[PDB]
Design an enzyme around this catalytic site. Structure first.
Site, short mmCIF file in Angstrom:
data_model
loop_
_atom_site.label_atom_id
_atom_site.label_comp_id
_atom_site.label_asym_id
_atom_site.label_seq_id
_atom_site.Cartn_x
_atom_site.Cartn_y
_atom_site.Cartn_z
N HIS A 1 0.82 -1.21 0.00
CA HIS A 1 0.00 0.00 0.00
C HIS A 1 0.86 1.27 0.00
O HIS A 1 0.44 2.32 0.48
CB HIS A 1 -0.95 0.02 1.22
CG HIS A 1 -1.95 -1.09 1.23
ND1 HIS A 1 -1.74 -2.28 1.90
CD2 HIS A 1 -3.13 -1.24 0.58
CE1 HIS A 1 -2.74 -3.10 1.68
NE2 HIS A 1 -3.60 -2.49 0.88
N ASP B 1 -5.47 -2.16 -12.92
CA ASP B 1 -6.65 -2.22 -12.08
C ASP B 1 -7.91 -2.22 -12.96
O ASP B 1 -8.32 -1.19 -13.50
CB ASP B 1 -6.62 -1.04 -11.12
CG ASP B 1 -5.57 -1.20 -10.05
OD1 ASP B 1 -5.21 -0.21 -9.36
OD2 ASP B 1 -5.08 -2.34 -9.88
N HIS C 1 -6.02 -8.29 -8.97
CA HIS C 1 -7.26 -8.45 -8.20
C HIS C 1 -8.57 -8.24 -8.97
O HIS C 1 -8.58 -8.04 -10.18
CB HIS C 1 -7.25 -7.47 -7.05
CG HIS C 1 -6.76 -6.14 -7.47
ND1 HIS C 1 -7.24 -5.52 -8.60
CD2 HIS C 1 -5.77 -5.35 -7.00
CE1 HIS C 1 -6.56 -4.41 -8.81
NE2 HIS C 1 -5.66 -4.28 -7.85
N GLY C 2 -9.67 -8.28 -8.23
CA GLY C 2 -10.99 -8.09 -8.81
C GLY C 2 -11.28 -6.65 -9.22
O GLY C 2 -10.51 -5.72 -8.94
N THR C 3 -12.42 -6.47 -9.88
CA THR C 3 -12.85 -5.18 -10.41
C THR C 3 -13.20 -4.10 -9.40
O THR C 3 -13.82 -4.39 -8.40
CB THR C 3 -14.06 -5.37 -11.33
OG1 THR C 3 -15.07 -6.13 -10.64
CG2 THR C 3 -13.63 -6.14 -12.62
MG LIG Z 1 -4.10 -2.33 -7.72
#
Ligand SMILES: [Mg+2]
Ligand SMILES: [Ca+2]
Ligand SMILES: [Ca+2]
Ligand SMILES: [Ca+2]
Ligand SMILES: [Ca+2]
EC number: 4.6.1.1
Lengths: 735, 146
Positions: free
Chosen positions: A288, A430, A514-516
């Site tokens: 992060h 993303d 990762h996911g949407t």
């Molecule tokens: Mg990302």
């Protein structure tokens, strides 16, 4: 777009059975060309002069080259073309008279004709040789210098080769012709005249009827859509702000097609576009830290956060560093730091991109260092020669905001394990959303299941069994240790992408981790520009949150694709406490829908937890209990509205039986609205509820007999002591 | 682990149907607290929960006895969400309503041959107010009601 409008249906068929006769003669296509150009035709009764509702002051007579021969005595007209914007052809008729001297109805054709010329072929694409060379039929091709019908005052200039040297000047005159030719080819009388005099214009017009009219009626139909569309910049014009690496976007292009599903991405930072192609792995959920947009480190996640965008944010950085550490602390072996080794191309890149300035060199400990300049004002930077490592230190006249001060150290960046090798990290892909076609999901359900479902005798249960199937194998999204929150296909899809950008050349691992964002219920982000890759393979990039929305509705929502939107839209996402708006059809219809028992009790609970005062207080005032007892009454009517035994009834009754139950509720609400000191907060609510009920009952009425207005209807009722006959009354009111 | 907000409801509602205003509800009274909440235990499924705790005079739960009862079937369920997305899927035009036209439509891409008859039919049985279409509410009912 109903092309023709008949004004006065005054004369018997005679007027009508005349307008028809008129139009049934003009080719269905010639009309389609009209409607297409947006035109409408007006057939009105006795309105000769400037009397029609569209016959007043706008583009009228400016120059005077009017009918076949020129005349211009307006007032003596019955046919006219509102020349300027959309073509508005206006015609009126009187007695039984066009056939004897068809020399009259012919103007309805030319008067029309000026419909398609100047936008037909004569000039619509341009005076395309077809008409440019056909026009050459002046006196050079056929031994028919018989153009005395269309070329008089403007072309008795037989002494001038008419090609591109002169035809422009009078685009207008070459219309006066295509028109008369039109009027002739279709005039109920003189058709042969055209076939016996100019021999080509006949064949020209003929081919036009052959299919030439369906022509433009398409290049216009097609430009109908492409014209008025949703301004998205398609193609590599998009692939540019897209961020995604082109070899990849393309790689993706295949999947889109094969699987048939829109792929949408959020902005991928440009300052990482190449670090990607290069082979730098991408940031997962585990890290992060904040990327950066300046200095050598740019486009990497500097372990030192004062070296990222939040440069100066003594607290963001303070909390930023705090996050890479945990990132490593917690996920050791897979997440840690390594030295920034800008390679070759990268340098020359951050160069013409003005991020770094390579200049003076220097010596230290026997090793060469090309000073790497950056207009920053606290850190100086230099890159090695042996290996391209990069270093920095706190200028001798400054300090780190955290209060640190040091000498030449290497710039470390965050890196994930990738095949037992800590590769540095940069932005990832993303996904904003993934829209597979409904047909695709169908192939996600295990035949036997879908079978055991459809092979049922219960009409309504089948539907249900399906929906769940569709829900299970398609809408449901579960959480995941690794890839965040997503669906299953969402995951199988997530793979095909990486494997797709792998047989390409990428050696950094995965680019989509990762996911949407549609599941970013936590910290939803709002990106203006969204990159999308349709199931066809085209690239697209919206410009607004709205356009994206609009785009999705036109191409995904109401086309055949499954799509769901972030549950936190129109709500207030906790994490970042943000309100991101997105059109919701269900809400559209809310105003006209009576609320439910629960939806009601809910809104009560709500307020209680706000103006700490509830509808009814736990006391002894027999007025309070009145209120309690009374809402319990509403939370009954509303409950009755939605009865599932309402099926043993007919449509007709349902509305009635419902409209009533509805009224019932509305009543007890007026009753409590007229009670004691019901907090003004609830007062407003009930005011709100009333309107729904109102809207609802109205809607239920409009479906039947509609001269009745809730307001009236209500009056006529009596909810005093006896409710009995009252209902019998009601029915009677609706007859 | 119901949220506080998730609790306020379960009280606003639990109380509203507490005739003799104490703080405990009968069995039939429970049946109604839930029904109103848009749920609906079976004539017999209604006992096994309440029946399961009998320290109040056998057959009467308090506020907690109830609040703590909103786990068994709740510390699991979240379909209420999907079902709303299922709905937006069949409402192909964005009107907030599902027409037989669009039922039949979505019904077939998913590969189901429905008879023009047996559609106007489903739509009908899902329509409660009689306006010919099914709204999120009517829909929600048809789905969950078992
Ligand atoms: Mg990302
Ligand atoms: Ca009680
Ligand atoms: Ca008990
Ligand atoms: Ca609809
Ligand atoms: Ca309905």
């Amino acid at each position: 777009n109903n092309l023709v409008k008949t004004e006065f249906t005054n004369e018997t068929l005679d007027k009508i059975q005349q307008t028809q006769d008129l139009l049934k003669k003009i080719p269905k296509d010639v009309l389609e060309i009209y409607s297409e150009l947006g035109g409408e035709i007006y057939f009105t009764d006795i309105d000769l002069v400037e009397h029609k509702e569209l016959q007043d002051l706008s583009e009228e007579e400016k120059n005077s080259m009017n009918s076949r021969g020129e005349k211009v005595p307006f007032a003596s007209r019955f046919v006219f073309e509102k020349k300027r914007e959309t073509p508005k052809l206006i015609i009126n008729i009187k007695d039984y008279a066009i056939n004897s001297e068809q020399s009259k109805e012919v103007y309805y054709e030319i008067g029309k004709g000026i419909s398609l010329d100047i936008i037909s072929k004569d000039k619509s694409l341009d005076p395309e040789f077809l008409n440019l060379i056909k026009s050459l039929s002046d006196d050079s091709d056929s031994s028919d210098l018989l153009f005395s019908q269309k070329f008089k005052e403007k072309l008795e200039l037989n002494n001038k080769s008419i090609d591109i040297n002169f035809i422009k000047e009078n685009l207008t005159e070459f219309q006066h012709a295509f028109s008369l030719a039109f009027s002739y080819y279709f005039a109920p009388d003189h058709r042969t005249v055209l076939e016996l005099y100019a021999p080509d214009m006949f064949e020209y017009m003929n081919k036009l009827e052959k299919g030439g009219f369906e022509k433009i009626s398409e290049s216009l139909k097609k430009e109908g859509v492409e014209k008025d569309r949703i301004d998205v910049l398609k193609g590599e014009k998009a692939l540019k702000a897209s961020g995604l690496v082109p070899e990849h976007a393309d790689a993706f292009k295949k999947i889109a097609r094969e699987l048939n599903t829109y792929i949408l991405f959020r902005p991928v930072n440009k300052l990482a576009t190449n670090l990607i192609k290069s082979g730098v792995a991408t940031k997962g959920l585990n890290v992060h830290g904040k990327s950066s947009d300046w200095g050598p480190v740019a486009g990497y996640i500097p372990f030192d956060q004062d070296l990222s965008k939040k440069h100066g944010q003594q607290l963001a950085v303070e909390k930023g560093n705090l996050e890479n550490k945990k990132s490593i602390t917690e996920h050791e072996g897979e997440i840690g730091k390594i030295p920034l080794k800008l390679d070759h191309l990268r340098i020359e890149e951050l160069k013409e991109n003005g991020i770094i300035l390579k200049g003076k060199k220097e010596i230290d400990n026997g090793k060469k260092y090309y000073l790497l300049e950056s207009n920053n004002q606290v850190y100086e930077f230099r890159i090695s020669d042996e290996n391209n490592e990069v270093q920095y230190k706190t200028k001798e006249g400054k300090i780190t905001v955290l209060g640190e001060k040091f000498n030449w150290r290497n710039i470390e960046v965050m890196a994930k394990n990738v095949e037992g090798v800590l590769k540095p990290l940069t932005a990832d892909y993303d996904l904003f959303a993934l829209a597979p076609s409904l047909t695709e999901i169908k192939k996600q359900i295990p035949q036997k299941e879908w079978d055991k479902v459809v092979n049922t005798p219960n009409s309504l249960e089948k539907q249900k069994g399906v929906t769940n199937l569709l829900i299970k194998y398609g809408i449901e999204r579960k959480p995941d240790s690794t890839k965040g929150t997503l669906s299953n296909w969402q995951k199988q899809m997530l793979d095909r992408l990486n494997e797709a950008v792998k047989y390409t050349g990428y050696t950094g691992g995965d680019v989509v981790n990762h996911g949407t964002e549609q599941d970013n219920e936590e910290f939803p982000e709002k990106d203006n520009e969204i990159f999308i890759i349709n199931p066809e393979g085209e690239f697209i990039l919206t410009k607004n949150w709205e356009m994206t929305g609009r785009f999705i509705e036109k191409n995904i929502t109401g086309k055949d694709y499954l799509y769901y939107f972030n549950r936190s839209y129109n709500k207030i996402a906790p994490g970042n406490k943000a309100y991101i708006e997105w059109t919701d059809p269900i809400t559209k219809a809310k105003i006209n829908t009576i609320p439910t028992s629960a939806e009601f009790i809910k809104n009560l609970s709500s307020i209680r937890r706000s103006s700490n005062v509830g509808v009814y207080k736990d006391s002894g005032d027999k007025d309070e209990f009145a209120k309690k007892e009374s809402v319990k009454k509403i939370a009954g009517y509303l409950s009755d509205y939605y009865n599932s035994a309402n099926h043993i009834f007919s449509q007709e009754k349902k509305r009635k039986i419902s409209i009533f139950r509805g009224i019932q509720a509305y009543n007890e609400i007026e009753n409590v609205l007229k009670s004691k000191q019901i907090a003004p907060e609830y007062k407003n609510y009930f005011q709100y509820l009333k309107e729904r009920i109102t809207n609802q009952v109205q809607l239920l009425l409009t479906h039947q007999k509609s001269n009745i207005e809730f307001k009236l209807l209500y009056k006529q009722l009596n909810f005093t002591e006896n409710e009995t006959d009252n209902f019998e009354v009601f029915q009677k009111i609706i007859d | 682990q119901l949220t506080e907000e998730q609790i306020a409801e379960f009280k606003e509602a639990f109380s509203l149907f507490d005739k003799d205003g104490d703080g405990t509800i009968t069995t039939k009274e429970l049946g109604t607290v839930m029904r109103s909440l848009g749920q609906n235990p079976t004539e017999a499924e209604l006992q096994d929960m309440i029946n399961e705790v009998d320290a109040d005079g056998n057959g009467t739960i308090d506020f907690p006895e109830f609040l703590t009862m909103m786990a068994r079937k709740m510390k699991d369920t979240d379909s209420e969400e999907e079902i709303r997305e299922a709905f937006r899927v069949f409402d192909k035009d964005g009107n907030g309503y599902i027409s037989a036209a669009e039922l039949r439509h979505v019904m077939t891409n998913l590969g189901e041959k429905l008879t023009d008859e047996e559609v106007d039919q489903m739509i009908r049985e899902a329509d409660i107010d009689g306006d010919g279409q099914v709204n999120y509410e009517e829909f929600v009912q048809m789905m969950t009601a078992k």
